[PDB]
Design a protein around this motif. Structure first.
Motif, short mmCIF file in Angstrom:
data_model
loop_
_atom_site.label_atom_id
_atom_site.label_comp_id
_atom_site.label_asym_id
_atom_site.label_seq_id
_atom_site.Cartn_x
_atom_site.Cartn_y
_atom_site.Cartn_z
N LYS B 19 -11.92 -11.08 -2.58
CA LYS B 19 -11.49 -11.10 -1.17
C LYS B 19 -10.94 -12.50 -0.84
O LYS B 19 -9.92 -12.65 -0.19
N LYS B 20 -11.55 -13.55 -1.33
CA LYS B 20 -11.10 -14.92 -1.15
C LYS B 20 -9.64 -15.08 -1.62
O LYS B 20 -8.74 -15.46 -0.86
N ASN B 21 -9.40 -14.65 -2.84
CA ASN B 21 -8.10 -14.83 -3.47
C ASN B 21 -7.04 -13.88 -2.93
O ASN B 21 -5.84 -14.21 -2.94
N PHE B 22 -7.52 -12.78 -2.36
CA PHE B 22 -6.61 -11.90 -1.68
C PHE B 22 -6.03 -12.68 -0.53
O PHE B 22 -4.81 -12.75 -0.38
N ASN B 23 -6.90 -13.28 0.22
CA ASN B 23 -6.54 -13.98 1.44
C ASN B 23 -5.70 -15.20 1.15
O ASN B 23 -4.78 -15.50 1.94
N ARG B 24 -5.95 -15.90 0.07
CA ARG B 24 -5.10 -17.04 -0.30
C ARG B 24 -3.75 -16.42 -0.58
O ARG B 24 -2.78 -16.95 -0.04
N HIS B 25 -3.59 -15.33 -1.34
CA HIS B 25 -2.23 -14.91 -1.65
C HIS B 25 -1.42 -14.38 -0.50
O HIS B 25 -0.25 -14.77 -0.44
N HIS B 27 -1.68 -15.43 2.49
CA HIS B 27 -1.35 -16.54 3.39
C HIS B 27 -0.51 -17.64 2.77
O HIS B 27 0.54 -18.00 3.29
N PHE B 28 -0.90 -18.15 1.63
CA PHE B 28 -0.23 -19.25 0.99
C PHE B 28 0.81 -18.83 0.02
O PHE B 28 1.71 -19.62 -0.19
N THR B 29 0.76 -17.69 -0.61
CA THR B 29 1.80 -17.33 -1.56
C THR B 29 2.96 -16.61 -0.89
O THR B 29 4.11 -16.92 -1.18
N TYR B 42 0.50 -6.53 1.70
CA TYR B 42 -0.85 -6.38 1.20
C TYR B 42 -0.80 -5.91 -0.21
O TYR B 42 -1.67 -6.34 -0.95
N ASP B 52 -3.47 -13.23 -11.38
CA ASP B 52 -4.21 -14.44 -11.77
C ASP B 52 -5.16 -14.19 -12.95
O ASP B 52 -5.15 -14.96 -13.91
N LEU B 106 -11.99 -5.53 3.33
CA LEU B 106 -10.88 -6.17 4.05
C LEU B 106 -10.24 -5.13 4.98
O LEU B 106 -9.53 -5.49 5.92
#
Ligand SMILES: *Cc1c(COP(=O)(O)O)cnc(C)c1O
Ligand SMILES: *Cc1c(COP(=O)(O)O)cnc(C)c1O
Ligand SMILES: OC[C@@H]1[C@@H](O)[C@H](O)[C@@H](O)c2nnnn21
Ligand SMILES: OC[C@@H]1[C@@H](O)[C@H](O)[C@@H](O)c2nnnn21
Lengths: 823, 823
Positions: B19-25, B27-29, B42, B52, B106
């Motif tokens: 869930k953490k890395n979902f949210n980084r991608h 937002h930031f990717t 999504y 990753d 999520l």
């Protein structure tokens, strides 16, 4: 799903996190590892790591503008001269030290990776750099602003000097990608060209057109430590490519190999004249940008708030479009086209909306350099837009008739349509009739606009005409490039000057403090030693780092008078040879800039400075009392190195040709004294510092005109001045090109015969003014007290003052020097 | 450096980190958030989260082949029909469970997000899916294997049926990007065209060539749960920009515009025949791939230890190149050029190294599929390659004369140079001459190759010739597409069958278990209910989910005989019309596939199938005892939806025309009985399941030859069979096209007068076999018990079996199913 959130994906202030993110980006984003990685990969892994702190605030800023629905300001420029984002982003985000510790502990020098980055190939001179300073100042004052332009794939070239000549090599700054931009496939718009107008019911239908697609890429532009990140949106031209065999039309021959190609080079390179590619470029960017502006007016609360067919009665209250020179002037017939033809508004309502929205900035002089397009060109690729222009014209000239009855020569001087051998549309006239404010870019530039070029327009509408003197951002041009000076200043007066630069006034209390005086001085010394060596780290010669660094860096142009400086350089040389034992303050004179492929004189001038260098730099007598260096491929990052090392700022255009200048203000801010004419913003710099503190010389705009009316005869200057007589013959006889004697054939005859910028006319006052410079240099304490007197008085020239004036006087929005919580 | 490692960058089977890395991608990717994200955003955020964990294993798999330098195998194909990567990467990595629980907390439905992914527009039929199945098997069996091919920007069209006709729309599967691929700008290679040869001292020089750049894109291909992730490297054609100044060729006139359009469209779309552009795709992929193979052979290991001038002696032991059809056959003269011209080895050494490196697979038979190129085409764009095909031919022809002294008919027969109206290079003769192993793709297919098409060659080198019956990967074609059936097989026998499909023989012990029997039927009924509803979620009619799902999904082509199936759908329709009250097992017949634009009989057949559906799905009498549906745009993810829903698999090619088939195998593994002829792999399948368990009909190859030998007159069939006679005259009278009576003229005269595929000759035996299918369907436990006999006996058809036989018998490597571990 409320946990699909920004809130905590990046713990700021942190070396440990930054090393984790560095490594995730190297291995996962880049798909490399230390064994395979190259310094370019290292630089990209760091660009992506700083980048994540940037898009966090970007998301949250656009969220904010969405809830808040403020007036958005659109800045159209066909040039954005950005040059290198890594260090600018880290200091506007306070990441510098942290990135620094992190890369150190990681085994990488942050400075060497900084040098891997390309200067963004998106601009060329001062028009572009001004749009870049202004986007940094709109973000810092919290305006809801957007930069719009083209994404040029090759920018404009890199300058290689081969055998004293400029060679223009290709710049594919995008070879490996650019980590700052975000492609936006979703938002792709079509732009239409050619076609014909079918005048139906309601009216016109622009039918049978070729389409080119406009895809947007976005880049974030961070404000100074307030957490607002704004957007720069650049369009890329993309061919529709169903054609392989599509529509069914297919067979003939592929004369749609040409459609992909000609669509594709709308973005490939930058430009300077009137050709169909230039008009396609200008319209490509206007059309896409205005579609996007209306899309965003419509979604954020006004599609909802339609009342009567989504009305635009409020459009001028939520959109301001700034038209930079006439290159985006087609925004005025294009907005009138979307509103009449597509939104079905009355001509009279749409015209009202248009002029309250658009405003025009003129950035350069002398009344013919402004765009005029043949009506047959416009007829062919933009038929609906010659129609709307003709109506705007029909209607503006009836206003003029209303105001000034019966004097017919002003109706035809004012016309957007010029007659002669080939009828043309004067785009500057278009720009005035359709904008609510017109402005010039330095007080004397705006005055000559009112008194010459645009005086009819000024007499119809005096109110329209304004002045907004150019600025420079003190983040990139002090804090970033001259960290040493930004430190001895913050020690004395605090750090709030960085976004309130008039606080540099407080420095006048230290003009007599021996401690400030020797600091100001040590920083320059330190900056010069650094520069003296870079100049041999990449390239080489032998620089005395104890000489007065004398520097002229700007584009190569006859109006800019690199030639006046060359005449003064060879005078110093003739002086030293005639009396090898005389004490002379030593100087390194450094000259840099780019000609323009095809600007023949400008190419010839670069070869003169080279030639001069080869003679005086290897003359055993001259020793190192004089060195002449042509600084190769000047651009923003080189401006960042040389401007903190400078002692004298050469700002010498013929009075009246340089509308403002902006290089002049970076040098005043970085501790250099200025030698220049009363042109552009030099006038206003001399008034802030005090004339006593400025080395003004030459002809004033008053005197140029007098010279014009008696007639300029260069032979009479040749004849009454022997050292000038001597340089010209040395140039004629091959003294400087011995292998090929009359290489300078051209320069000599233009000088002597048809020099439009009157070099010889200002020569004697120039070299006497220079003599006074050398005398002050000889006295360190005083030299440095006038330097303090200049740095302390440069606040007026912050782009933050320039933009708070555009905001309150043209755009009608209030600046805000306030924090956004984030990330 | 040491601290720039994959260090501990994700915890895998941990929801909390996904869930953490979902949210980084997101937002930031992707630079979106929840207000703004679309369904596609999504999906792209889930794609980057999963990716990753793939590249971490990928980097470690390539480091490991570097330190172990194993024999590497290059699978060259001009098609890779990958179709959709997200769900295959999560079950191959054991991440699906975890991702399903992460997207669900999520607030996202992962099933809907999988549906947003585009099939990779990289392939077309059986040659492409074989290559994708084999990349998944090479990876699961731990081979150091690389797929090489071309990245097409728009595949080969998406099919739309408009007014019952195929319409092809362009496919830009790449519009929004592709998160699975890594552009590698750094590794661009140049491919040469045209030019002429300078036979200098050491020999030939290929000079004055056109250059196209070959930029690679890497896609990771994961093995089932053993952590090896091999590579699919796909080449993209770039035009060299210097459409500006270089060679000053131009700089006055443009037509270099054609070199850019033509260079670049080597990559745009896929192909089927003989023109200059095909040969440029073919040489392009061969040239770029072969530079990388040599590069990686020198660089990975052999550029520092190398025993004799870097030795190619060891090259046959460290590289295996598999040539799929004649499409890559220039790899044999390209290998020779590079070794002889660039590396300076002797033609004999380099030829010894070339035939030990290359092996050839033939995939279809009639000499049409075995490319021939005019030597004039070859003399112009590949002049050095033509010099080498001639030298190879000479030397080869001396060998055949040594073995068969005086048999001149043989020399002229085996030669690579075909005379005639235009002299031609028979590319199949080049791959056989230059390969150490030649194989067909099913036992009857490899027999006919040794027997008819290549018997002369077989006589000269019998040992070269082999068989390698095709397979199917049980991951995509069972676990992934049929989770229900995979689950009830794992309750009885465990889950080792996923990588050892012969274990399914264990299910024969459950042929009589009443619970197994009703689980196998429950699964089938759920797949049908689900597909009956997809069919009207997207598209629509009314499908009775209880009827027998009768399906033919494969390219539309006269040898596959969709027309034979049409003759039966109308027989069934005619039957019901004579007796509207007779009891009939109700059927949904579903036909799907793409024609080939330009194959006119095939677009007529798609129109028949649609027209026959217009008539019968609207006949009130028929009700819902017959429905005819054409599945629009059959591709790999639709084959994943329909193949688990099928009851009957139509595999009805004329005996001797289908080399193997592979769809036949996907239906057998998913619980569908097969009605088919003794063609291709239907022969070995019937043999594995027992002939009693297969609905075999019609003519056998020995019979087709007889009939041939006596001549096929279709009228004698027309004459002695009345239902047939009635069908034909209904086609003829316009009963199926009332608005255009003779619309199906072409079909009727082909059938009546020049049917190369003997449709009327298998029709009786075919409708009778179909009645048996119907008799058995009425008995639901016997039908399911014959299904268990087919599902439990499908193990030989795993592509893991096929690949272990290529490994041992052709490439000289051993499969390994040792889980390379870790991170
Ligand atoms: C400041 C700047 C300019 C403008 O300098 P002027 O002397 O005003 O023409 C041009 N180029 C670069 C690289 C600059 O930074
Ligand atoms: C398996 C497959 C094929 C091959 O089918 P055959 O009937 O053997 O030709 C073609 N296309 C797709 C989508 C496939 O999945
Ligand atoms: O306003 C920015 C700058 C001015 O400072 C220059 O003096 C003028 O030549 C110019 N032309 N285009 N842009 N500019
Ligand atoms: O070998 C793979 C498949 C075979 O299964 C088909 O039967 C054959 O028609 C074919 N042609 N190209 N590729 N293929």
């Amino acid at each position: 799903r409320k946990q699909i959130s920004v809130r905590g994906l990046a713990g700021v202030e942190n070396v440990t996190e930054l090393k984790k993110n560095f490594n995730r980006h190297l291995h996962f984003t880049l798909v490399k590892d230390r064994n395979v990685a190259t310094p370019r990969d290292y630089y990209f892994a760091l660009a992506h790591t700083v980048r994540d702190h940037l898009v966090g605030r970007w998301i949250r800023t656009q969220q904010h503008y969405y809830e808040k629905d403020p007036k958005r300001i659109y800045y159209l420029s066909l040039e954005f001269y950005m040059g290198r984002t890594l260090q600018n982003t880290m200091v506007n985000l306070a990441l510098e030290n942290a990135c620094d510790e992190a890369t150190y502990q990681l085994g990488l020098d942050m400075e060497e990776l900084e040098e891997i980055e390309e200067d963004a190939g998106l601009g060329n001179g001062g028009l572009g750099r001004l749009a870049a300073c202004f986007l940094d100042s709109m973000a810092t004052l919290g305006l809801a602003a957007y930069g719009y332009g083209i994404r040029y794939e090759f920018g404009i070239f890199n300058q290689k000097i081969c055998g004293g000549w400029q060679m223009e090599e290709a710049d594919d700054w995008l070879r490996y990608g650019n980590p700052w931009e975000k492609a936006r496939p979703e938002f792709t718009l079509p732009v239409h060209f050619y076609g014909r107008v079918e005048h139906t019911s309601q009216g016109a239908k622009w039918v049978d057109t070729q389409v080119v697609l406009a895809m947007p890429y976005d880049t974030p532009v961070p404000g100074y430590r307030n957490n607002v990140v704004n957007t720069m949106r650049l369009w890329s031209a993309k061919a529709p490519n169903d054609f392989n065999l599509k529509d069914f039309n297919v067979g003939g021959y592929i004369q749609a190999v040409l459609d992909r190609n000609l669509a594709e080079n709308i973005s490939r390179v930058l430009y300077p004249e009137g050709k169909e590619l230039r008009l396609k470029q200008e319209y490509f960017v206007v059309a896409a940008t205005l579609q996007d502006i209306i899309r965003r007016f419509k979604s954020s609360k006004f599609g909802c708030r339609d009342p009567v067919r989504t009305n635009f009665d409020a459009f001028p209250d939520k959109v301001a479009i700034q038209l930079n020179d006439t290159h985006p002037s087609l925004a005025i017939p294009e907005l009138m086209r979307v509103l009449v033809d597509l939104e079905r508004l009355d001509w009279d309502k749409a015209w009202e909306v248009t002029v309250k929205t658009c405003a025009y900035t003129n950035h350069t002089v002398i009344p013919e350099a402004l765009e005029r397009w043949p009506v047959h060109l416009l007829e062919t690729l933009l038929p609906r837009h010659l129609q709307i222009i003709y109506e705007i014209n029909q209607r503006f000239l009836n206003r003029v008739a209303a105001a000034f009855p019966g004097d017919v020569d002003r109706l035809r001087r004012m016309s957007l349509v010029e007659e002669g051998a080939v009828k043309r549309i004067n785009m500057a006239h278009l720009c005035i009739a359709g904008s609510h404010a017109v402005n010039g870019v330095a007080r004397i530039h705006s005055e000559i606009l009112k008194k010459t070029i645009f005086k009819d327009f000024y007499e119809l509408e005096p109110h329209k005409f304004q002045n907004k003197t150019n600025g420079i951002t003190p983040r990139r041009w002090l804090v970033l490039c001259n960290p040493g000076l930004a430190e001895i200043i913050a020690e004395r007066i605090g750090e709030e000057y960085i976004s309130d630069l008039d606080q540099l006034r407080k420095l006048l209390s230290y003009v007599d403090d021996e401690a400030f005086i020797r600091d100001v001085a040590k920083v320059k010394q330190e900056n010069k030693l650094k520069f003296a060596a870079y100049l041999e780290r990449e390239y080489k010669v032998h620089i005395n780092p104890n000489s007065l660094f004398d520097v002229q860096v700007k584009r190569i142009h006859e109006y800019k008078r690199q030639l006046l400086n060359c005449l003064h350089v060879i005078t110093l040389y003739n002086r030293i040879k005639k009396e090898p034992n005389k004490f002379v303050v030593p100087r390194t004179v450094m000259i840099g800039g780019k000609p323009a492929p095809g600007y023949h004189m400008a190419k010839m001038i670069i070869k003169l400075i080279t030639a001069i260098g080869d003679v005086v730099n290897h003359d055993p007598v001259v020793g190192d009392r004089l060195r002449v260096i042509f600084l190769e491929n000047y651009r923003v990052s080189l401006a960042e190195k040389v401007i903190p090392a400078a002692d004298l700022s050469e700002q010498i255009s013929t009075a009246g040709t340089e509308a403002s200048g902006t290089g002049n203000m970076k040098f005043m801010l970085n501790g250099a004294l200025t030698i220049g004419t009363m042109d552009g913003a030099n006038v206003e710099m001399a008034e802030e510092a005090g004339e006593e503190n400025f080395f003004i010389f030459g002809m004033r705009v008053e005197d140029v005109d007098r010279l014009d009316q008696r007639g300029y005869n260069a032979q009479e200057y040749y004849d009454r001045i022997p050292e000038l007589r001597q340089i010209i013959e040395q140039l004629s006889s091959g003294f400087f090109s011995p292998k090929q004697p009359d290489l300078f054939k051209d320069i000599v005859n233009m000088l002597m015969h048809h020099d439009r910028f009157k070099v010889f006319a200002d020569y004697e006052e120039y070299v006497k003014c220079q003599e006074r410079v050398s005398a002050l240099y000889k006295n360190p304490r005083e030299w440095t007290r006038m330097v303090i007197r200049n740095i302390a008085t440069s606040g007026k020239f912050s782009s933050d003052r320039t933009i708070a004036q555009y905001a309150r006087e043209i755009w009608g929005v209030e600046p805000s020097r306030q924090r956004l919580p984030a990330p």
